[PDB]
């Protein structure tokens, strides 16, 4: 929501209140999403200054505020700056931005990441190129320098982030993506590679000096129809946990498939179904093992652009004897969303 | 402050800067509230959407940002997301909202919670139904489906919160309230029940599998006059700490009495006095004990709807040989508050 | 950005998104600012209400959100509320505010605090009177009761803060400052004295029952020209750490010099140069040693009142065999700043 627009400068102060509850059997963990309260709220700004007829500047910040914490010592648990970056766009030259921003491979992963509650199970936070990641410099250009309508591309440089956990750490890397759209159809490819930190190599799981993530996506999004498919592979990049040994790290190689089918009725309901399967290979001590496997059925009912409610049921296909102890139970989500 | 009202959506972004300092004798270890800087600020949005002529959607978030911390490690000390929920209200059927919201017994306890700084001594955070509490689904109806002016009621369902601390944990529970108001007068009733967590039962102080809180309140609110009285009882629900043995948990039974007398002068002054006594029964090893017991004298000076200053003097009646080690010294509040 | 001005009340919701990167050689440990991503965002309100023709009330809060932290445990590493105070201003009598606000000695050091990123190296956070500090009661007076135009002064009270770290700790104290300006020229003097906390004296480095900070400044600021000089001394007040022995505390005496020369070109560029040298004396075990010593060359390019970019190169003069183990290497800043 835009709350300031004077002297050629405009600020969208947006956010949301998401009442959310999760339902799984018993206590939670051998489930997909867990059980209990998951309420959260968001705040953020989208700021934009027009320097001249061709040149625009912008900056955006966004925070995730949890509502499922007490006011005691754990009051801060699960809070995070999601985005904080700044950039410029000059005519048909393109845009360039630095700060904490979404990885470049996500341009593909965005295709199937559309569910009411869950989904996008391969868009891990702070996981190199597949999700939000700090210290990325990205150049983007839409329509190929303005010369070919629908042909957009991007290149991203990922700065070294030597963090405390090998899960959240990353070395220097580069990635790129191209997407093309014509009369409802879309195709996209994205690939990124990066150095790994020593702390990442000294982890029990994973072997390599280079992390690699690539993903392609197809979609049709027109006439109230949204369909999407994503296929991707990772090399020494997907974060994983051995639940029996309490050992952590990254999987040597993973194969990710996402299918999404949704329709938007004019009276407000948007039924959604999905299937996502991400399986790892050459996991040390285990070999081949499935990380994510589910069929999804759910629906969003939109009261308006300010209010909605939804329910999303994940049928988890992971086996109870999953070699990483991955939760096998189903999970259903109940949500009521006010936003601006 | 209303800063957006368009396309049937309005967002009031409200908050405050509160210069706040407490003055107590010696150091205040043994006082009511303690001594030193207690400056704070609040932030929150109230978003409200008109879906159609009868149907409103709403969503709210609210934060307490501390001003008494360094820029170091304790930077987060005392910060907390206070309120965070979303819901709908439909014609005269009523309202429903889910997320983190004020407890149902607060409907009653709200009557006496009017001091300049202190007060509402039984409306504890994450204390089941008497204060702010996570994962509650609340239904309220105003004017009894529109048929009886002044007749409001509510039913509340409290979802399980299994936490790391026994103080902030709570099991599944349900509660309700009904209030009637007539020509300056008000009467309110509230009661709530819930399972206790193992972790609460395995606590040193307190025994029971069910926590129960009820309170009834009367008030006069007209012609610049505010008078209120609240009485309530709790069973295995009020949080307590043994200061000599340094052990924590909950009191077996408590009886809470609050008297409040306030007047608002037209020239900006609002003098206030109060009396608060909350006493425990069946505390293991100690027996009967006073938790809160004080007379209060103070005044709030309102410059306008945007600026005020206040003083709140807690005349502590607690005795130096209090069996729970409760502070006996006096505490003074000095506050200067800008809000918008 | 001012987003509300109604009913004698106005609210500025302001902030920024700063993409920022540091450049140092190798790991960057042994440099001035370090190496890597330092992206951050700030958010805040400046609220001001007109109570009547002479009296305005105000309140301000300001927060630091980091953009260089993960979403993991370190999501919070370095976030903190910067300002939180409330006050009033009456005609030419003066202004008064209490809470967390800039230290009184900052009145002088502010002169040289003009660099793109760095600079003002003696304006340490929570360092008594030299930087932002918790619990100050401040009186400020402009134009001396309206009797002498340009003659401003200030008195500041520092409340006791016995913290977890002696670094962010502080005792009872008082300070004052006076400044006069005439047709581009400015001169200011500022001094503050305060009790030290027990925890500060039990530190290995530093001896005294009183911390003292004083600084004087000159500047010329007109016709796009800015020149400034600040000199100051501290007695048992500036915080220091020995990198070899891993011990911390405060320096017995410090002598601080800052020069800044800037010119503002109309096409947006503002080239900046500076020199900062702060050297300590009576450092236990070491004697005389330099904490800060550099010549600075850099430039900021303003796209307009909302957008900027900068590069700032720090030429460090500190020697590799620095007795306090202070980094000897140079540091580069690359920043792109959107604000509102």
mmCIF file of N, CA, C and O in Angstrom, chain B residues 84-122:
data_model
loop_
_atom_site.group_PDB
_atom_site.id
_atom_site.type_symbol
_atom_site.label_atom_id
_atom_site.label_comp_id
_atom_site.label_asym_id
_atom_site.label_seq_id
_atom_site.Cartn_x
_atom_site.Cartn_y
_atom_site.Cartn_z
ATOM 1 N N UNK B 84 -1.116 -10.137 17.304
ATOM 2 C CA UNK B 84 -0.972 -10.482 15.893
ATOM 3 C C UNK B 84 -2.058 -11.433 15.416
ATOM 4 O O UNK B 84 -1.941 -12.648 15.587
ATOM 5 N N UNK B 85 -3.107 -10.882 14.803
ATOM 6 C CA UNK B 85 -4.240 -11.708 14.387
ATOM 7 C C UNK B 85 -5.032 -11.206 13.192
ATOM 8 O O UNK B 85 -4.881 -10.073 12.763
ATOM 9 N N UNK B 86 -5.893 -12.076 12.676
ATOM 10 C CA UNK B 86 -6.764 -11.716 11.565
ATOM 11 C C UNK B 86 -8.129 -12.371 11.718
ATOM 12 O O UNK B 86 -8.233 -13.509 12.186
ATOM 13 N N UNK B 87 -9.172 -11.660 11.295
ATOM 14 C CA UNK B 87 -10.526 -12.157 11.455
ATOM 15 C C UNK B 87 -11.576 -11.450 10.624
ATOM 16 O O UNK B 87 -11.254 -10.549 9.863
ATOM 17 N N UNK B 88 -12.834 -11.854 10.780
ATOM 18 C CA UNK B 88 -13.942 -11.260 10.044
ATOM 19 C C UNK B 88 -15.092 -10.937 10.972
ATOM 20 O O UNK B 88 -15.274 -11.579 11.995
ATOM 21 N N UNK B 89 -15.875 -9.943 10.582
ATOM 22 C CA UNK B 89 -17.096 -9.569 11.273
ATOM 23 C C UNK B 89 -18.225 -9.426 10.257
ATOM 24 O O UNK B 89 -18.114 -8.671 9.292
ATOM 25 N N UNK B 90 -19.316 -10.146 10.498
ATOM 26 C CA UNK B 90 -20.390 -10.287 9.521
ATOM 27 C C UNK B 90 -21.727 -9.777 10.041
ATOM 28 O O UNK B 90 -22.384 -10.457 10.828
ATOM 29 N N UNK B 91 -22.127 -8.589 9.597
ATOM 30 C CA UNK B 91 -23.417 -8.012 9.968
ATOM 31 C C UNK B 91 -23.604 -7.969 11.483
ATOM 32 O O UNK B 91 -22.775 -7.405 12.201
ATOM 33 N N UNK B 92 -24.665 -8.610 11.968
ATOM 34 C CA UNK B 92 -24.916 -8.687 13.404
ATOM 35 C C UNK B 92 -24.666 -10.078 13.961
ATOM 36 O O UNK B 92 -24.898 -10.323 15.138
ATOM 37 N N UNK B 93 -24.184 -10.982 13.117
ATOM 38 C CA UNK B 93 -23.855 -12.328 13.562
ATOM 39 C C UNK B 93 -22.716 -12.256 14.573
ATOM 40 O O UNK B 93 -22.750 -12.925 15.607
ATOM 41 N N UNK B 94 -21.707 -11.440 14.281
ATOM 42 C CA UNK B 94 -20.608 -11.258 15.210
ATOM 43 C C UNK B 94 -19.239 -11.249 14.563
ATOM 44 O O UNK B 94 -19.115 -11.228 13.341
ATOM 45 N N UNK B 95 -18.208 -11.249 15.402
ATOM 46 C CA UNK B 95 -16.828 -11.227 14.949
ATOM 47 C C UNK B 95 -16.097 -12.481 15.378
ATOM 48 O O UNK B 95 -16.418 -13.084 16.395
ATOM 49 N N UNK B 96 -15.121 -12.862 14.566
ATOM 50 C CA UNK B 96 -14.224 -13.975 14.843
ATOM 51 C C UNK B 96 -12.817 -13.634 14.417
ATOM 52 O O UNK B 96 -12.617 -13.237 13.281
ATOM 53 N N UNK B 97 -11.842 -13.786 15.308
ATOM 54 C CA UNK B 97 -10.457 -13.575 14.890
ATOM 55 C C UNK B 97 -9.505 -14.598 15.497
ATOM 56 O O UNK B 97 -9.691 -15.036 16.636
ATOM 57 N N UNK B 98 -8.490 -14.979 14.720
ATOM 58 C CA UNK B 98 -7.485 -15.919 15.209
ATOM 59 C C UNK B 98 -6.080 -15.378 15.089
ATOM 60 O O UNK B 98 -5.730 -14.693 14.118
ATOM 61 N N UNK B 99 -5.289 -15.710 16.100
ATOM 62 C CA UNK B 99 -3.916 -15.279 16.214
ATOM 63 C C UNK B 99 -3.627 -15.030 17.678
ATOM 64 O O UNK B 99 -4.269 -15.617 18.550
ATOM 65 N N UNK B 100 -2.711 -14.108 17.946
ATOM 66 C CA UNK B 100 -2.379 -13.745 19.315
ATOM 67 C C UNK B 100 -3.136 -12.492 19.723
ATOM 68 O O UNK B 100 -2.875 -11.398 19.224
ATOM 69 N N UNK B 101 -4.064 -12.667 20.653
ATOM 70 C CA UNK B 101 -4.955 -11.598 21.052
ATOM 71 C C UNK B 101 -5.194 -11.638 22.559
ATOM 72 O O UNK B 101 -4.848 -12.624 23.219
ATOM 73 N N UNK B 102 -5.777 -10.569 23.105
ATOM 74 C CA UNK B 102 -6.050 -10.502 24.540
ATOM 75 C C UNK B 102 -6.999 -11.622 24.998
ATOM 76 O O UNK B 102 -7.977 -11.941 24.323
ATOM 77 N N UNK B 103 -6.691 -12.212 26.150
ATOM 78 C CA UNK B 103 -7.515 -13.250 26.748
ATOM 79 C C UNK B 103 -8.948 -12.831 27.034
ATOM 80 O O UNK B 103 -9.243 -11.640 27.155
ATOM 81 N N UNK B 104 -9.842 -13.812 27.142
ATOM 82 C CA UNK B 104 -11.260 -13.524 27.341
ATOM 83 C C UNK B 104 -11.583 -12.945 28.723
ATOM 84 O O UNK B 104 -12.466 -12.098 28.853
ATOM 85 N N UNK B 105 -10.840 -13.366 29.742
ATOM 86 C CA UNK B 105 -11.065 -12.872 31.097
ATOM 87 C C UNK B 105 -10.621 -11.421 31.166
ATOM 88 O O UNK B 105 -11.023 -10.669 32.061
ATOM 89 N N UNK B 106 -9.824 -11.011 30.183
ATOM 90 C CA UNK B 106 -9.384 -9.636 30.163
ATOM 91 C C UNK B 106 -10.603 -8.747 29.931
ATOM 92 O O UNK B 106 -10.630 -7.598 30.382
ATOM 93 N N UNK B 107 -11.643 -9.322 29.320
ATOM 94 C CA UNK B 107 -12.901 -8.607 29.091
ATOM 95 C C UNK B 107 -13.394 -8.033 30.412
ATOM 96 O O UNK B 107 -13.938 -6.927 30.473
ATOM 97 N N UNK B 108 -13.158 -8.796 31.473
ATOM 98 C CA UNK B 108 -13.471 -8.374 32.821
ATOM 99 C C UNK B 108 -12.311 -7.583 33.408
ATOM 100 O O UNK B 108 -12.487 -6.481 33.944
ATOM 101 N N UNK B 109 -11.114 -8.137 33.280
ATOM 102 C CA UNK B 109 -9.958 -7.549 33.941
ATOM 103 C C UNK B 109 -9.615 -6.175 33.373
ATOM 104 O O UNK B 109 -8.936 -5.371 34.014
ATOM 105 N N UNK B 110 -10.103 -5.919 32.165
ATOM 106 C CA UNK B 110 -9.924 -4.637 31.517
ATOM 107 C C UNK B 110 -10.543 -3.498 32.302
ATOM 108 O O UNK B 110 -10.089 -2.361 32.194
ATOM 109 N N UNK B 111 -11.575 -3.795 33.091
ATOM 110 C CA UNK B 111 -12.269 -2.758 33.862
ATOM 111 C C UNK B 111 -11.371 -1.928 34.783
ATOM 112 O O UNK B 111 -11.487 -0.703 34.825
ATOM 113 N N UNK B 112 -10.469 -2.587 35.500
ATOM 114 C CA UNK B 112 -9.637 -1.902 36.487
ATOM 115 C C UNK B 112 -8.245 -1.530 35.979
ATOM 116 O O UNK B 112 -7.488 -0.843 36.665
ATOM 117 N N UNK B 113 -7.923 -1.980 34.770
ATOM 118 C CA UNK B 113 -6.625 -1.718 34.153
ATOM 119 C C UNK B 113 -6.543 -0.328 33.520
ATOM 120 O O UNK B 113 -6.511 -0.200 32.299
ATOM 121 N N UNK B 114 -6.498 0.710 34.351
ATOM 122 C CA UNK B 114 -6.598 2.086 33.856
ATOM 123 C C UNK B 114 -5.596 3.064 34.468
ATOM 124 O O UNK B 114 -5.703 4.274 34.250
ATOM 125 N N UNK B 115 -4.649 2.560 35.253
ATOM 126 C CA UNK B 115 -3.699 3.442 35.930
ATOM 127 C C UNK B 115 -2.838 4.168 34.888
ATOM 128 O O UNK B 115 -2.838 3.784 33.720
ATOM 129 N N UNK B 116 -2.117 5.225 35.293
ATOM 130 C CA UNK B 116 -1.240 5.897 34.325
ATOM 131 C C UNK B 116 -0.142 4.980 33.787
ATOM 132 O O UNK B 116 0.130 4.999 32.583
ATOM 133 N N UNK B 117 0.456 4.177 34.668
ATOM 134 C CA UNK B 117 1.563 3.296 34.295
ATOM 135 C C UNK B 117 1.380 1.843 34.737
ATOM 136 O O UNK B 117 1.539 0.925 33.938
ATOM 137 N N UNK B 118 1.061 1.640 36.009
ATOM 138 C CA UNK B 118 1.004 0.305 36.578
ATOM 139 C C UNK B 118 -0.422 -0.228 36.444
ATOM 140 O O UNK B 118 -1.179 0.240 35.593
ATOM 141 N N UNK B 119 -0.786 -1.222 37.253
ATOM 142 C CA UNK B 119 -2.162 -1.709 37.278
ATOM 143 C C UNK B 119 -2.486 -2.915 36.405
ATOM 144 O O UNK B 119 -1.684 -3.322 35.570
ATOM 145 N N UNK B 120 -3.672 -3.490 36.607
ATOM 146 C CA UNK B 120 -4.067 -4.704 35.913
ATOM 147 C C UNK B 120 -3.181 -5.853 36.350
ATOM 148 O O UNK B 120 -2.822 -6.717 35.559
ATOM 149 N N UNK B 121 -2.848 -5.862 37.634
ATOM 150 C CA UNK B 121 -1.872 -6.789 38.199
ATOM 151 C C UNK B 121 -2.160 -8.278 38.012
ATOM 152 O O UNK B 121 -1.306 -9.109 38.310
ATOM 153 N N UNK B 122 -3.356 -8.628 37.555
ATOM 154 C CA UNK B 122 -3.650 -10.035 37.279
ATOM 155 C C UNK B 122 -3.792 -10.419 35.794
ATOM 156 O O UNK B 122 -4.204 -11.535 35.473
#
